[PDB]
Swiss-Prot record:
The gene is ANK1. The modification (3S)-3-hydroxyasparagine is found at N27, N60, N225, N258, N324, N357. Regulated by phosphorylation. The modification Phosphoserine is found at S25, S355, S377. This is Ankyrin-1. The chain holds residues 405 to 812 of 1881 of the full protein. The modification (3S)-3-hydroxyaspartate is found at D291. Isoform Mu17, isoform Mu18, isoform Mu19 and isoform Mu20 are expressed in skeletal muscle. Isoform Br21 is expressed in brain. Component of the ankyrin-1 complex in the erythrocyte, composed of ANK1, RHCE, RHAG, SLC4A1, EPB42, GYPA, GYPB and AQP1. Interacts with a number of integral membrane proteins and cytoskeletal proteins. Interacts (via N-terminus) with SPTB/spectrin (beta chain). Also interacts with TTN/titin. Isoform Mu17 interacts with OBSCN isoform 3/obscurin. Interacts with HIF1AN. Interacts (via ANK 1-5 repeats) with RHCE; this interaction mediates the primary membrane attachment site for ANK1. Interacts (via ANK 1-2 repeats) with AQP1 (via the N-terminal). Interacts (via ANK 1-13 repeats) with EPB42. It comes from Homo sapiens.
Length: 404
């Protein structure tokens, strides 16, 4: 650090004048370190910069990170240090090693005036980060509403996106910012924009149980049957996270209760997995298929039995599920309850008529499994009712699931 760097940053107009008169120059080393002008900008020391600029200070001089003096002026939210850097000749579209322009920065802090000042002067709003963002995206993330307006009132791209496909509307919903959403749609933010996984804004709101946002999205046309690459709908997500009120809203908007994903999973199936009786109610009342099957042949009972929640297993049974529903490989809701050692379900399944003498495509009978896993409490209950091993003899059984 030269005496002039310390001078500028400290705001010592006296000295800075002196050093510059006595032959000192604004931009010393021909490398890329922060200059006395950058130092000037940050501290907001205007006169000091109104000087260095007089002399020959470079305004587009780049620092380590490639950030320019103008980039600092911005971060601070010092409109005048900006109206000045600009007034002279700072290029507003110079990016940082990450792709940030003074504009994104201003955007993040929510420095309305600074942004306006930046727009007035060719500051491009198409400028993208390497994360795939634009000033509007940033606006939406840190929920800066009037930056969003101003930005839109002046040709922002309602739904420009990087390589991930995340549109401003996508971000906005993600960081629950109704203010921005209700603001984007009219200006054209599309409710259909697919992300890198095919997720449409409604998928998000649906998952994070945001009825408010969901309503809007639907209102403007968004489909509740839009498919992720997995073939997963917003209904799936909403059901899987047990968000009942939403699962109701969606259904009441042509959401297809029986539509399954890439492998065959129907919302009810996922509901059986996490076991949320309420949603399970909403769907069956609506008229979903109770014993809808996967590609392999698992029913929501198979699934509800396999995993924990026995409560849901009652519900499915009460609502007439087929308790001897077999898989393409002979596995029944009992084999699962056994294989996972859920005694109480092996009690309930049997009680509700489940057959215990069913040999699978392997050779296993629910007792055979309970035994091999050393789950004893279960082996006891099956021991009695299970029949004779008219033969003697390790492949298991898992219901299909959604990925990552
Ligand atoms: Br609306
Ligand atoms: Cl320059
Ligand atoms: Cl200001
Ligand atoms: Cl993300
Ligand atoms: Cl994001
Ligand atoms: Cl995420
Ligand atoms: Cl928020
Ligand atoms: Cl099927
Ligand atoms: Cl389990
Ligand atoms: Cl469960």
């Amino acid at each position: 650090l030269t005496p002039l760097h310390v001078a500028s940053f400290m705001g010592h107009l006296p000295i800075v004048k002196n050093l510059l008169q006595r032959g000192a120059s604004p931009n010393v080393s021909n490398v890329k370190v922060e200059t006395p002008l950058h130092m000037a900008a940050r501290a907001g020391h205007t006169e000091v910069a109104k000087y260095l600029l007089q002399n020959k200070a470079k305004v587009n001089a780049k620092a380590k990170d490639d950030q320019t003096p103008l980039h600092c002026a911005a971060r601070i939210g010092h409109t005048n240090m900006v109206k000045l850097l600009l007034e002279n000749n700072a290029n507003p579209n110079l990016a940082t090693t990450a792709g940030h322009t003074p504009l994104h920065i201003a955007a993040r802090e929510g420095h309305v005036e600074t942004v306006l000042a930046l727009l007035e002067k060719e500051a491009s709003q198409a400028c993208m980060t390497k994360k795939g963002f634009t000033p509007l995206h940033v606006a939406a993330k840190y929920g800066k509403v009037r930056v969003a307006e101003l930005l839109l009132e002046r040709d922002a791209h309602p739904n420009a996106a990087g390589k991930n496909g995340l549109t401003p509307l996508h971000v906005a919903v993600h960081h629950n910012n109704l203010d921005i959403v209700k603001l984007l749609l009219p200006r054209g933010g599309s409710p259909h924009s697919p992300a890198w996984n095919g997720y449409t804004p409604l998928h998000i709101a649906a998952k994070q149980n945001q009825v408010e946002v969901a309503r809007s999205l639907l209102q403007y046309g968004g489909s509740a049957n839009a498919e992720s690459v997995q073939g997963v709908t917003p209904l799936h997500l909403a059901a899987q996270e047990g968000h009942a009120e939403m699962v109701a809203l969606l259904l009441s908007k042509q959401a297809n209760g029986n539509l399954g994903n890439k492998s065959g999973l129907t919302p009810l199936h996922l509901v059986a997995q996490e076991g949320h009786v309420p949603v399970a109610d909403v769907l069956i009342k609506h008229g979903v298929m109770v014993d809808a099957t996967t590609r392999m042949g698992y029913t929501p009972l198979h699934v509800a039995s396999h995993y924990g929640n026995i409560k849901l297993v009652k519900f499915l049974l009460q609502h007439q599920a087929d308790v001897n529903a077999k898989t393409k490989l002979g596995y029944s809701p009992l084999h699962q309850a056994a294989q996972q050692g859920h005694t109480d379900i092996v009690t309930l399944l049997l009680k509700n008529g489940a057959s215990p003498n069913e040999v699978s495509s392997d050779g296993t009978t629910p007792l055979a499994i309970a035994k091999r896993l050393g789950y004893i409490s279960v082996t006891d209950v099956l021991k009695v009712v299970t029949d004779e091993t008219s033969f003697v003899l390790h492949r298991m059984s898992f219901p299909e699931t959604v990925d990552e």
